Design a protein around this ligand. Structure first.
Ligand SMILES: [Zn+2]
Ligand SMILES: [Zn+2]
Ligand SMILES: [Zn+2]
Lengths: 131, 814, 71, 397, 105
RNA sequence: AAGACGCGC
RNA sequence: GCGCAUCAUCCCGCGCCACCUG
């Protein structure tokens, strides 16, 4: 008969036993907050514009190509552990971008034709808006 | 009888006739060897190898067919192992690398296929043979057969042979076997070093001169096979070797010195230093020996001793350098080959260890010697030192002396060799800025060598200019470089092909070192002058001019008219039939830059019309050119033309355009996810059961696209493509099987192992056998990669009344 | 003739491999993956009032002969 | 239809723990690994508080974690075995406040596979070699050395594969400047699957396999294979050399076994039980975690049972022979996945669930009023639990 | 390698040394023979790198002038986590080619 | 002029 | 024996792997 189709896939890495879509901060927007069995709490934030999504995707790809994980594990393979990633952008690399030494971050800044200060401002804008 | 009557006909078919006939004959030999047997076949084959008038080609073909028929037959060659061995022995004893490799492969196949018992039975009696050549070839046979199947299975047998008391010949043979194992195995004998050392020890104690010499050689071979570690297993051999060093003389002294020199790097720094100090007196006493072999041995020993860190620069300089350098610099000993290379290696190692200063400062004077061999040797030492250590140790006097020496050596160019040019280039590169005052002298000398007696020494002059252009440009002499460039420009009319190639290479170097807009020759006139050079036939000038025009298109494309662009494109299509692969790669690169510079319409139309040459050599080149054009230009401006060209019913055109699509998808990578929808009808049409080549091309396109678009969520069209790709698994041609396997692997890594497991679970236990086999191999291919997801993708199997097949741990509910 | 990597791997079936071998290999792989994954082991140790050490010990003992005796 | 992934709260549960001088100073530090987060935290002896100093995410599953140092050195390196088929050695830089990679060697495919090394990791106590082992059929040995530039070097892996065998635990054995030694609970199962009578479970005992590491021959060979009376759980490394005798303790059901290579007799000691147990007597008792304290004057071992009882294991031995093993009840704490005994009289307990406590040792309780047990006593043992007396709670996380 | 099925790899445990490639095989991939996106280096085994074998081309066996590399597709397909990718055979084509060249040369 | 592979009159 | 077709397959002129020799 009729069969549904999957539009999104991701691998948090820990068992998830909670899932809800409610606002957290007053005056904010709806978010998909989830809680895992390991004791971590995370949220999912939609993209309000195409330019922001493109910038975030470019930043994530450049960080993956330039800054590998510490244990030598492929980030794309780690996220595509059981099923391929679909329409999900990881923010962990974007937040870890603030921890690297200045040389590489500045270099990727002109590689993206942008500057580190406004890049950090845009990174913190999502956090201060949806959380 | 009839079995033998069918042998000589096939032999004459495979040895005489066209290659297709001999290949076909070999085919039915391989096919029908199951029923033919081995007995009469060998009884007829072996006398052919026994013929004294055997040729190289006949021997190679016969040994190849023997190898193949022996690979096919597992345990059907036992009765004739001795005959095969004794007839391969002359083949392996030869001094040909390929022949000895084939012989050792044959013997390894014998060891793998045949049992050890029959080999032992046919192998034992010839150990104590009086003839020496058979003993040597049997030693090689033992080496290779013990390399096969592992050494420990016959190590006690070797110990028993070496412990023989009847004659010294058996002990000599056993020590030869140990030496051969050491020289052939390499690092595979390290766990079994102690037993071999104990076996060789008592043979070393033996009073026979031949036995003790071969024991020393075996010890040296074991030491060089265990160079990193193994001194603890060798510390029990030092005393007899020292006794031989201090007592024995002659060949035994040489063998013992070689063994101790090999053993010196094994131990620690202090022990090595003490032993080098002990042996230095004997080395000094032996340097002036007339024998060349002993001189080579002591040179190698000195090099090995100097390579160790136990010695110090001051001590080695004050002890061994004066006498060795006095007694080891003569033309009579320089006339040799092995002595030449060993002296070069020893001097360069000594220069690296102690320093280059004195070792070059007191050979630059000898560089002035009129002897050509002495000059070549000293220049080779100089260039090796410059390449290894560097040049930040030279003062003005030494550097000017070296410049004078190299200029004098190059001026008296009598022999034909590129070592002159290599040495000069290494010298000028090492000098760098410090040679800038001298550049006008080199320019004048190279000009004088260039303009004389009708283009004979101009080849090396142009090669020298190309090599030295880097330092010429970094010396800030731009006007001189432009003068050389323009002069060489009017020197472009030389008829000689190699001279013309050297000219083209020099022009490439001069236009690469400096910007093109600063070049004095007219490019707008240079290209019409290079076009006849493009129409040339010699390989060197062709490749040089193709790379030159590639550089023209890469950088100087603004000053070139489109008419001559299209024309040189026409001769690029004409020239695409070149034999060399580098020429074709440079040619397709030139198409890439031309299509980047100008609109990809005329060049695309010309390339698409070259798919009817009736030869795949040009078709693949045109395919690569079209792919690079589409990659360097807008893809959406190329695909409609590709489809329109596909609309023709020409099979070659369809294959070419499909390969072009595959190459384009491979090149673009992730950017081509937007063009997936445009090629789906073409892929569906190609996947139809019409032509095998169409299916292979479609599978290649699917695999390349799947790898490219992986990780971006394009499964909707990939699943539809797999729905048509899947029914192509049931095929027999190896090429289509490989293409299908690659396509399914790409679809697995893109979609995920779950869908692949679902598809492969349909017939894992089919009643038929072929479908079960192909499903099982596909399942194995899926299971090898990304195994950690199949656990979640496994289905549920209901347990029986005797076994449990349900994982109850996954049914827990919180 | 690149079947060397196929033969040099443990845990995969071939032409006449019966159901029992496939199921025991599946069970062994499942147990090893359970041991490797911290989250699933924690889930198992939460489901039953036990400890992770005891759970992994029992899982190791289950690796001796899954799916009953061979037939 | 595109979402952005964030993390408001990081993982808190602790799966592994280790301690050492990771900053090059005398101040001890603790490195614990979360599910997929590696962070460094150290306590303050003056106040007893614990503050995190660094927290990074590795984007991978951590299966092993332990520290080592070279002989004569002052800094401890970090070795972690992830699901990826490679091994990486870490190093903490106090100036940059981040982990610096020093080496990375690949040896197999990624993912939690049955025959891929990474599950078990062993390091030589002296700090000259490291051993990584898989669940089945795979074992690799690496050599750790320092070059003339005072930088870490990695040698080639060693072939130590054994077909159709299962490994329960791998741990290094002290040799005292001799060749490094490794011991594992290797056992075979080839005959288990070939018997249709169902006797695979019966007549199948574990073996204590020993492996050398011959630096001269650069190869590994099996030393012994000693069958065991009952199945074991994990092994303990006894500090050997000049300070104490070399050996290994085997933890099993209701028993502890001491074994050593040579002519060392076996020593057995039943695990004491509480007074008037309310549980089922048929249920066995095992060990969940253990610690150590290699004090120069005298070393002792700490272990925790299933119910959380802390037992102070004291080993009594002659110059070269072992006499008896004396068990003693220390205190009772919540069950902990890993426990580390810090210097300066501090104990850190990484509880399996709930909050993590940091007790402070005040009285060692050497021969207190409570009687102690020993292996020399003929035939079980019973002890009465008491509230916290030796340990004093200071701070909890 | 890919074109000729006769050639086989040693498939031994990877060592610490890095393989080399000659001028002819400067950009070829060690598995699929591609000149696109070289990302990761190539490791050689201890047996394949000993004495005379040091500094030799992985594919054909000429002098080593450039370092070998793995392409992007090979890295994605997880094919680089395998044994030593060095050919131990000498190739059937090379033997015939050398024999005919020696005969007609 | 060469290493393999598959296609029918 | 005919007509064919595929593998960015070869087209590289000779290379050198511990050795000959009183
Ligand atoms: Zn090559
Ligand atoms: Zn190899
Ligand atoms: Zn590749």
């Amino acid at each position: 008969s009729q069969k549904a189709e999957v539009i999104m896939n991701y691998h948090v890495g820990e068992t998830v036993l909670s899932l809800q879509k409610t606002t957290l901060i007053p005056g904010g927007s709806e978010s998909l907050v989830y809680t895992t069995l390991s004791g971590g709490i995370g949220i999912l934030v939609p993209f309000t514009s195409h330019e922001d999504h493109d910038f975030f995707q470019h930043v994530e790809m450049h960080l993956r190509s330039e800054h590998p994980p510490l244990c030598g594990r492929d980030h794309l393979s780690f996220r595509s552990y059981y099923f391929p990633v679909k329409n999900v952008i990881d923010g962990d690399l974007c937040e870890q971008f603030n921890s690297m030494e200045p040389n590489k971050q500045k270099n990727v800044s002109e590689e993206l034709d942008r500057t580190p200060p406004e890049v950090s401002k845009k990174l913190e804008d999502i956090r201060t808006r949806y959380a | 009888e009839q079995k033998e009557r069918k042998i000589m006909k096939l032999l004459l078919k495979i040895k005489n006739g066209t290659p297709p006939m001999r290949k076909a004959a070999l085919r039915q030999i391989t096919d029908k060897a199951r029923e033919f047997g081995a007995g009469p076949l060998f009884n007829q084959i072996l006398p052919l190898l026994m013929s004294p008038t055997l040729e190289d080609q006949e021997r190679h073909l016969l040994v190849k067919v023997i190898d193949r028929i022996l690979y096919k037959l597992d345990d059907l060659v036992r009765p004739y192992v001795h005959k095969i061995l004794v007839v391969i022995e002359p083949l392996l004893i030869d001094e040909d690398y390929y022949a000895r490799v084939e012989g050792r492969e044959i013997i390894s196949n014998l060891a793998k296929a045949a049992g050890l018992a029959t080999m032992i039975s046919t192998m034992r009696p010839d150990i104590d043979n009086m003839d020496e050549y058979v003993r040597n070839t049997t030693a090689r046979a033992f080496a290779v057969v013990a390399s096969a199947l592992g050494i420990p299975s016959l190590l006690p047998f070797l110990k028993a042979v070496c412990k023989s008391k009847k004659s010294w010949q058996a002990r000599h043979t056993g020590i030869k076997i140990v030496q051969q194992i050491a020289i052939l195995m390499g690092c595979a004998i390290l766990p079994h070093l102690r037993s071999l050392v104990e076996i060789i020890e008592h043979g070393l104690v033996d009073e026979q001169q031949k036995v003790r010499t071969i024991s020393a050689l075996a010890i040296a071979a074991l030491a060089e096979a265990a160079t990193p570690y193994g001194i603890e297993s060798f510390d029990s051999v030092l005393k007899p070797l020292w006794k031989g060093i201090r007592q024995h003389r002659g060949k035994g002294l040489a063998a013992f010195l070689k063994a101790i020199g090999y053993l010196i790097p094994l131990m620690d720094a202090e022990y090595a230093n003490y032993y080098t100090r002990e042996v230095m007196l004997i080395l000094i006493r032996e340097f002036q020996s007339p024998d060349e072999e002993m001189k080579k041995i002591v040179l190698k020993v000195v090099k090995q001793c100097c390579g160790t860190d136990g010695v110090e620069a001051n001590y080695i300089k004050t002890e061994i350098l004066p006498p060795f350098f006095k007694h080891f610099w003569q033309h009579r000993m320089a006339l040799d080959r092995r002595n030449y290379r060993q002296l070069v290696d020893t001097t360069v190692e000594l220069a690296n260890k102690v320093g280059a200063a004195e070792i070059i400062s007191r050979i630059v004077d000898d560089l002035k010697d009129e002897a050509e061999q002495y000059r070549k040797m000293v220049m080779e030492t100089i260039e090796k030192i410059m390449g290894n250590l560097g040049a930040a140790d030279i003062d003005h006097k030494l550097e000017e002396q070296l410049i004078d020496g190299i200029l004098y050596a190059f001026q008296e160019q009598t022999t034909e060799d590129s070592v002159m040019l290599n040495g000069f280039g290494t010298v000028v590169n090492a000098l760098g800025k410090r040679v800038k005052p001298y550049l006008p002298q080199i320019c004048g000398t190279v000009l004088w060598r260039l303009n004389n007696k009708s283009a004979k020494v101009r080849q090396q002059a142009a090669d020298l200019i190309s090599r030295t252009a880097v330092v010429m440009k970094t010396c800030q002499e731009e006007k001189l470089m432009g003068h050389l460039g323009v002069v060489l420009y009017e020197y472009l009319g030389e008829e000689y092909p190699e001279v013309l190639g050297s000219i083209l290479g020099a022009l490439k170097a001069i236009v690469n070192v400096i910007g093109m807009h600063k070049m004095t020759p007219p490019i707008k006139d240079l290209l019409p002058r290079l076009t006849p050079i493009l129409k040339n036939r010699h390989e060197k000038v062709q490749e040089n001019c193709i790379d030159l025009v590639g550089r023209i298109a890469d950088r100087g494309a603004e000053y070139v008219s489109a008419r001559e662009w299209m024309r040189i494109c026409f001769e690029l299509l004409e020239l695409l039939k070149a034999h060399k692969k580098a020429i074709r790669r440079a040619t397709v690169n030139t198409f890439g830059y031309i299509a980047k510079a100008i609109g990809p319409h005329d060049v695309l139309a010309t390339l698409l019309n070259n798919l009817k040459v009736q030869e795949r050599q040009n078709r693949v080149c045109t395919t690569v050119a079209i792919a690079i054009v589409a990659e360097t230009c807008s893809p959406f401006t190329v695909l409609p033309a590709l489809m329109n060209e596909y609309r023709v019913p020409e099979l070659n055109v369809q294959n070419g355009v499909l390969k072009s699509l595959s190459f384009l998808f491979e090149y673009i990578g992730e950017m081509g996810k937007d063009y997936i929808y445009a090629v789906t009808p073409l892929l569906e049409d190609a996947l139809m059961d019409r032509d095998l080549v169409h299916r292979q091309t479609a599978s290649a396109v699917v695999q390349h696209m799947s790898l490219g678009v992986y990780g971006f969520g394009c499964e909707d069209s990939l699943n539809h493509l797999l729905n048509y790709v899947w029914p192509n698994v049931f095929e027999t041609s190896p090429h289509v099987i490989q293409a299908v396997m690659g396509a399914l692997e790409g679809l697995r890594v893109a979609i995920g192992p779950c869908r692949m497991l679902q598809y492969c679970l349909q017939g894992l236990f089919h009643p038929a056998r072929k479908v079960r086999d192909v499903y099982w191999k596909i399942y194995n291919s899926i299971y090898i990669g990304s195994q950690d997801a199949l656990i979640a993708h496994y289905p549920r199997i209901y347990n029986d009344d005797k076994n449990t097949y349900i994982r109850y741990e996954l049914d827990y509910i919180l | 003739q690149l079947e060397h990597l196929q033969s040099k791997y443990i845990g995969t079936g071939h032409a006449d491999t019966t159901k029992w071998e496939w199921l025991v290999n599946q069970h062994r792989d499942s147990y090893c993956s359970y041991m490797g994954h911290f989250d699933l082991l924690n889930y198992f140790a939460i489901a039953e009032n036990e400890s992770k050490a005891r759970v992994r010990f029992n899982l190791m003992e289950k690796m001796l002969q899954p799916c009953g005796p061979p037939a | 239809m595109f979402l952005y992934n964030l993390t408001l709260q990081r993982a808190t549960g602790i799966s592994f723990a280790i301690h050492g001088n990771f900053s090059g100073t005398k101040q001890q530090e603790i490195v614990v690994s979360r599910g997929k987060i590696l962070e460094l935290l150290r306590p303050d002896p003056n106040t007893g508080k614990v503050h995190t100093l660094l927290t990074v995410e590795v984007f991978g599953v951590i299966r092993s974690l332990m520290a080592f140092r070279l002989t004569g050195g002052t800094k401890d390196y970090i070795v972690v075995g992830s699901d990826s088929g490679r091994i990486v050695i870490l190093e903490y830089q106090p100036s940059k406040n981040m982990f610096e990679k020093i080496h990375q060697e690949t040896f197999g495919k990624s993912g939690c596979r049955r025959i891929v090394p990474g599950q078990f990791l062993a390091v030589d106590p002296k700090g000259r070699a490291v051993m990584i082992s898989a669940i089945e059929k795979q074992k690799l040995v690496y050599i750790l050395n320092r070059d003339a530039a005072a930088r870490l070097t990695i040698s080639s892996p060693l072939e130590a594969h054994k077909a159709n065998t299962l490994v329960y635990h791998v741990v290094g054995v002290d040799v005292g400047f001799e060749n490094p030694m490794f011991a594992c609970l290797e056992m075979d199962y080839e005959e288990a699957d070939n018997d249709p009578t169902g006797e695979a479970a019966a007549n199948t005992q574990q073996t204590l396999t020993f492996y050398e590491l011959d630096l001269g021959l650069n190869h590994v060979v099996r030393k012994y294979s000693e069958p065991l009376e009952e199945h074991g759980n994990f092994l303990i490394t006894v500090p050997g050399g000049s300070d104490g005798p070399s050996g290994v303790l085997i933890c099993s059901e209701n028993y502890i076994t001491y074994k050593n290579f040579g002519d060392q007799p076996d020593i057995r000691c039943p695990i004491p039980r509480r007074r008037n147990d309310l549980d089922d007597p048929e249920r066995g008792m095992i060990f969940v975690c253990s610690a150590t304290h290699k004090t120069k004057s005298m070393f002792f071992f700490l272990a925790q049972t299933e119910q959380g009882d802390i037992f102070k294991i004291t080993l009594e031995t002659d110059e070269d022979m072992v006499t008896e093993i004396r068990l003693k009840y220390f205190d009772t704490v919540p069950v902990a996945a890993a426990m580390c005994v810090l210097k300066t009289g501090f104990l850190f307990v990484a509880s399996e669930f709930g909050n993590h406590y940091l007790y402070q040792i005040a009285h060692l309780g050497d021969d207190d009023e409570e009687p102690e047990f020993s292996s020399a006593m003929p035939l079980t043992f019973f002890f009465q639990p008491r509230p916290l007396k030796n340990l004093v709670l200071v701070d909890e996380l | 390698a890919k074109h000729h099925p006769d050639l086989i790899f040693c498939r031994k445990q990877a060592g610490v040394a890095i393989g080399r490639l000659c001028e002819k095989c400067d950009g070829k991939c060690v598995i699929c023979d591609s000149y696109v996106r070289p990302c990761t280096l190539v490791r050689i085994c201890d047996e394949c790198n000993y004495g005379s074998y040091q500094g030799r081309c992985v594919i054909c066996g000429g002098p080593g002038v450039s370092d070998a590399y793995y392409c992007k597709e090979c890295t994605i397909q997880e094919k680089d986590r395998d044994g030593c990718p060095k050919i131990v055979n000498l190739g059937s084509s090379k033997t015939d080619l050398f024999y005919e060249r020696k005969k007609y040369g």
